[PDB]
Design a protein around this nucleic acid. Structure first.
Ligand code: SF4
Ligand SMILES: [Ca+2]
Ligand SMILES: [Ca+2]
Ligand SMILES: [Ca+2]
Length: 351
DNA sequence: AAGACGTGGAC
DNA sequence: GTCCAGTCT
C-alpha cells in the first residue's frame, strides 16, 4: 500500500543532506545519547545545547554521573525544568553501574526497567547508539505520522502513540534503524513544523495524504489543555547582620523536589502573617512590607509570588531542612527559576 | 486515564 | 492569549 523503501530512501537521503551538527551527534556513545534524549524531553534543542555541554563537561562518563552527589547533578540541571528527569537519570545511571557494570543495556526490556526510561527513550537511545530497531515516537514523530497517513486519533491518548509505533514498525528501514528514527525527528523539527509546515520543500511530499487533502495545518489532533490553578505564594528573603541568608531544601517528593528555595507558604490570604508564624516553628523573625509581586508558570499551575524582606537574629541552631548561606555561596545551590527571580528582584531593590 | 511535573520560544 | 519543545502515578 505504502512504498516503504521509496519513502525510506527519500527521507534518509534528505537526512544525510540536512542533518544539523548537534553536540550529541558527534558520536553514538549510549551515555551521551541517553543524557541528550532525556534533556530533550519537553525541551527545545536551542535551550538544551548549553546544558548538555556543561553536563557532559562535569559528568563525562556514566560513572562520573553515578559517583556524583545528588546536589551537584541538580545544580547542573538548574533551570532546565522537570527535575525528576535528572533524579531518575542519576538513579538509573547508578543502577547501570551497580547492576550492569557501567554498560548501558542494549535489551529493550532490560533498559526500560531503568527509572525515567519510557517508550520514547528506549527507542531513541537503543536505535541510535546500538542499532536496535525499536520505534522512537515522540510528539514530533506523532505529528509527522498523523499527516503522512492522515491519522486523526487524539495523540494524547497512549493508544494513539502505540498505533504510530506500529506504523513505524511497518515502514521502518531495518537496515539503518537509528538513522530512520532520527530522520523522522529531524523531519519534524525542520520541515513538518507545528504551524505552517514547509511541505513544498518536504522530501516526502508525494507520500503525504494530508498534503494531498490540504489539511496538514489541521493536524495532529489533540485535546485542548486543562486550565491551570492559580496559587498565591509568600516568600521570605531573610538576612542577618553578617549578610547571610536563610534558604531551605524542598522535600524529595513532588513539586521542585530537592531544589533549594527561600522559605515560602501558600497563602490562600495573609502574607507577612502566615510567613512569620511558619519561620519560628522551624528563629525570631519579624517581617516588613513587600517589595514586588510577580507570576511564574508551571505546566499545571501558576505561582503568584510576593516577596517580603526581613531581618534575622540567631536565637538557636539552623535545623534541617534549613541552611544558613552567605550571599557569596548562594551561587552553589540550585534554585527554581521563580526563586532565582525572587533574589534578583530583592537584590535590585536593595540598591 | 488524567494529573503532576518547569521552562522558554514561536506563533 | 495558544501551542509545544515524555514519564511517573
Ligand atoms: S508533506 Fe507536509 S504535512 Fe506531509 S510530512 Fe511533509 S511537511 Fe509534513
Ligand atoms: Ca520503563
Ligand atoms: Ca520533538
Ligand atoms: Ca513533598
Amino acid at each position: 500500500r505504502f512504498p516503504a523503501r521509496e519513502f525510506q530512501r527519500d527521507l534518509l537521503d534528505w537526512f544525510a543532506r540536512e542533518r544539523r551538527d548537534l553536540p550529541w551527534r558527534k558520536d553514538r556513545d549510549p551515555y551521551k545519547v541517553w543524557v541528550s534524549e532525556v534533556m530533550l524531553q519537553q525541551t527545545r534543542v536551542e535551550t538544551v545545547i548549553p546544558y548538555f555541554e556543561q553536563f557532559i563537561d562535569r559528568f563525562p562518563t556514566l560513572e562520573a554521573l553515578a559517583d556524583a552527589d545528588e546536589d551537584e547533578v541538580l545544580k547542573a540541571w538548574e533551570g532546565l525544568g522537570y527535575y525528576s528527569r535528572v533524579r531518575n537519570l542519576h538513579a538509573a545511571v547508578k543502577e547501570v553501574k551497580t547492576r550492569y557494570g557501567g554498560k548501558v543495556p542494549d535489551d529493550p526490556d532490560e533498559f526500560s526497567r531503568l527509572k525515567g526510561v519510557g517508550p520514547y527513550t528506549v527507542g531513541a537511545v537503543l536505535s541510535l547508539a546500538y542499532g536496535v530497531p525499536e520505534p522512537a515516537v515522540d510528539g514530533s514523530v506523532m505529528r509527522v505520522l498523523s499527516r503522512l497517513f492522515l491519522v486523526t486519533d487524539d495523540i494524547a491518548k497512549p493508544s494513539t502513540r502505540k498505533r504510530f509505533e506500529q506504523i513505524v514498525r511497518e515502514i521502518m528501514a531495518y537496515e539503518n534503524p537509528g538513522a530512520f528514527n532520527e530522520a523522522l525527528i529531524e523531519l519534524g523539527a525542520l520541515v513538518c513544523t507545528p504551524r505552517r509546515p514547509s511541505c513544498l520543500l518536504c522530501p516526502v511530499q508525494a507520500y503525504c495524504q494530508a498534503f494531498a487533502e490540504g489539511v496538514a495545518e489541521e493536524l495532529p489532533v489533540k485535546m485542548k489543555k486543562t486550565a491551570v490553578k492559580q496559587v498565591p505564594l509568600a516568600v521570605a528573603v531573610l538576612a542577618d547582620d553578617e549578610g547571610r541568608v536563610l534558604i531551605r531544601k524542598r522535600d524529595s517528593t513532588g513539586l521542585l523536589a530537592n531544589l533549594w528555595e527561600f522559605p515560602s507558604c501558600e497563602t490562600d490570604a495573609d502574607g507577612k502573617e502566615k510567613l512569620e508564624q511558619m519561620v519560628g516553628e522551624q528563629l525570631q523573625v519579624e517581617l516588613t512590607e513587600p517589595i514586588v509581586s510577580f507570576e511564574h508558570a508551571f505546566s499545571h499551575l501558576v505561582w503568584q509570588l510576593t516577596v517580603f524582606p526581613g531581618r534575622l537574629v540567631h536565637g538557636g541552631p539552623v535545623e534541617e531542612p534549613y541552611r544558613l548561606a552567605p550571599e557569596d555561596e548562594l551561587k552553589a545551590y540550585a534554585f527554581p527559576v521563580s526563586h532565582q527571580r525572587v533574589w534578583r528582584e530583592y537584590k535590585e531593590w536593595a540598591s
